[PDB]
Amino acid sequence: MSDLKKAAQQAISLMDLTTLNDDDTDQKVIELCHKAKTPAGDTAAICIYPRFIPIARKTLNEIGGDDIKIATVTNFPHGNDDIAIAVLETRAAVAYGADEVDVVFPYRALMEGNETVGFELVKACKEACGEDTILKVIIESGVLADPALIRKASELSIDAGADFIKTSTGKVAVNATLEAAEIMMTVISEKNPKVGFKPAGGVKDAAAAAEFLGVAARLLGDDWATPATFRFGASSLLTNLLHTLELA
Amino acid sequence: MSDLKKAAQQAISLMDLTTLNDDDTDQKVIELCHKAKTPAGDTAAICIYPRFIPIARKTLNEIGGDDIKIATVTNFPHGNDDIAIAVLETRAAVAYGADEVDVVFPYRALMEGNETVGFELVKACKEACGEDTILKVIIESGVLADPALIRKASELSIDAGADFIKTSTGKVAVNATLEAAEIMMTVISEKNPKVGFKPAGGVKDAAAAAEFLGVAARLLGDDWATPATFRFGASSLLTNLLHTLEL
Ligand SMILES: [Cl-]
Ligand SMILES: [Cl-]
Ligand code: NA
Ligand code: NA
């Protein structure tokens, strides 16, 4: 379907193609780099564990992937409230050569009533990134669950300097939801439309992708979603999108 | 045994207590930190994968392990000849908070006749260590095998700024040998006695530790081996040494 095909095409261009598994290997990351060069155009990025960034950058720069960004994760997936540890991991991610770092918000601390440590952790990790590395903040909306907490995590993250707010780690029972997307992009519209949104997990197919893009278009404008403002964090979405486009 | 127990005690004080397994976890690294606080005194260091450095430092600083160093590995275990990758990994190790980085020498390239990349990779990684992180260079002497190659990798590494030269990754068939130790510490005595030596893997027991220390004593002097100049890289030696000390 043309509406569906347009969504599939845009979703691929906005994808953070991800592999974050305990049994990941250089070989598997190399294969992911090749997969990022899709028949429908390059994805926006790949997302991998920090130690695989050097071989991924080497590989992308060998296969025409020079403009595919490398994102990684820190404070992950636990979202513990030790700022020092999150900062060290973020510094290492930057040193490996990450273009983007997706850090996990201390959501358990927020749920216990501590708003300060979330703000300070994001602020400290953004400082470790600098002006030239993107920081995405995973608020784990699927666990926060409560709309007020989702909103508060989003506000704290943006005030602390987040470049993106991201729904989920993909490691818990509930990942990206439309309900969370509504809240988070509303907060973005209220505070700073330069801040991006990243639904991660929970995006089945092109139809689901279209739904998330539809919320963005509605709240922030038809042209708002771009690689600089919107990413799909996905490990098993691309093949379905390619089938929607009748490829692979 | 008196001489044996003295060797065991010293070997513990010089140990880089190591865990480098594909199934390593935060929990296993925390347990290793506690194990480094041995009944015979603290080990010199622990050696773990870079991503575990932050939780290891937090743990050591909680449990009286403040003076136990954290070493890690880069370009590991392959010793590939891509300098850019080895340097990025070394920069990351430093950023994680490593006190020491054990980088693998491009030993296959040397066996193919390329001395240049060995020198250049060690030199670049030493630069990435900055001022506050020392560099150990793993030459994989058990694979180099030939005395000329073991000597050459040692010389190249030291000229390139290595703070230690280290026999092995522990991930190949042959690790530390007494023959390699002889050659490597002879090169140290020739060039710079401030450079350290680290036999890694294949140190069986107190008797074997005593043999390696005996080589150091003969080539460099009775008082030469210290935490700043000698480490045992070991993942399964400590329990044996404690049994020798009857602990
Ligand atoms: Cl990692
Ligand atoms: Cl690692
Ligand atoms: Na982690
Ligand atoms: Na490695």
Q: Strand A37-38 vs strand A41-42: parallel, antiparallel, or unpaired?
A: antiparallel
Residue B198 is a catalytic residue: yes
Q: What is the length of chain A?
A: 248
Three-state SS string over B26-81 comes to HHHHHHHHHHHEECCEECCEEECCHHHHHHHHHHHHHCCCCCCEEEEEECCCCCCC
User: A-chain residues within 8 Å CB-CB of B94?
Assistant: 95
Which pair of structure tokens corresponds to residue B37? Answer: 């606080």
Burial of A113 (0-12, 13-18, 19+ CB in 10 A): exposed
Which pair of structure tokens corresponds to residue B144? Answer: 């180099």
Q: Which residue has the tokens 């000849």?
A: B81
Interface test with B, best of A24, A55, A74 (most B CBs within 10 A): A55
- Amino acid letter at B113? G
Q: CA–CA separation, B50 vs B74, rounded Å?
A: 8
Residue A198 is a catalytic residue: yes
Q: CA–CA separation, A158 vs A153, rounded Å?
A: 9
**A65-to-A34, A94, A227, B214 alpha-carbon distances in Å:** 8, 19, 15, 54
In chain A, alpha helices (H): 2-13, 26-36, 53-60, 83-96, 107-111, 116-129, 141-144, 147-159, 178-191, 206-220, 238-244
- Amino acid letter at A10? Q
CA B123 to chain centre: 18
| Among the listed residues B31, B67, B61, the one whose alpha carbon sits nearest the alpha carbon of residue B48 | B31
Q: Does A26 touch chain B if contact means CB atoms closer than 8 Å?
A: no
Q: CA–CA separation, B43 vs B232, rounded Å?
A: 10
Neighbour tally for B112: CB within 10 Å: 10
Q: Does A77 touch chain B if contact means CB atoms closer than 8 Å?
A: no
Q: Which entry of B69, B123, B152, B198 is annotated as an active-site residue?
A: B198
Q: Do residues A241 and A12 make contact, with C-beta atoms less than 8 angstroms apart?
A: yes
Q: Do residues A163 and A132 make contact, with C-beta atoms less than 8 angstroms apart?
A: no
Q: Does B96 touch chain A if contact means CB atoms closer than 8 Å?
A: yes
Q: CA–CA separation, B12 vs B7, rounded Å?
A: 9
Domains of chain A: 1-248 (3.20.20.70)
Q: Do residues B206 and B7 make contact, with C-beta atoms less than 8 angstroms apart?
A: yes
Q: Using alpha carbons only, what angle is made at residue A235 by residues A231 and A239, rounded to the nearest 5 degrees?
A: 95
Q: Which residue has the tokens 């392959």?
A: B78
Closest chain B C-alpha to A29 CA, distance in angstroms? 15
Q: Does A89 touch chain B if contact means CB atoms closer than 8 Å?
A: yes
Q: Strand B134-138 vs strand B164-166: parallel, antiparallel, or unpaired?
A: parallel
CA of B197 to the centre of ligand 2 (A): 24
Return the DSSP state at B200.
B
Residue A204 is a catalytic residue: no
Q: CA–CA separation, A164 vs A128, rounded Å?
A: 16
Chain B residue nearest residue A83, CA to CA: B54
Angle between helices A26-36 and A53-60 (to 10 degrees): 40
Q: Which residue has the tokens 């009533």?
A: A113
Per the CB < 8 Å rule, is A89 touching B51? yes
Which pair of structure tokens corresponds to residue A133? Answer: 């590395």
**A215-to-A153, B131, B167 alpha-carbon distances in Å:** 19, 51, 59
Identify which ligand lies nearest to the alpha carbon of B52: 2
Chain B residue nearest residue A85, CA to CA: B54
Annotate B5-33 with DSSP letters as a single string.
Answer: HHHHHHHHHTEEEE---TT--HHHHHHHH
- Amino acid letter at B81? D
Interface test with B, best of A49, A72, A76, A85 (most B CBs within 10 A): A85
CA of A74 to the centre of ligand 1 (A): 9
Neighbour tally for A194: CB within 10 Å: 10
Per the CB < 8 Å rule, is A96 touching B89? yes
Q: CA–CA separation, A170 vs A51, rounded Å?
A: 19
* Residue B198 backbone phi and psi in degrees, to 5: -135, 100
Per the CB < 8 Å rule, is A53 touching B88? yes
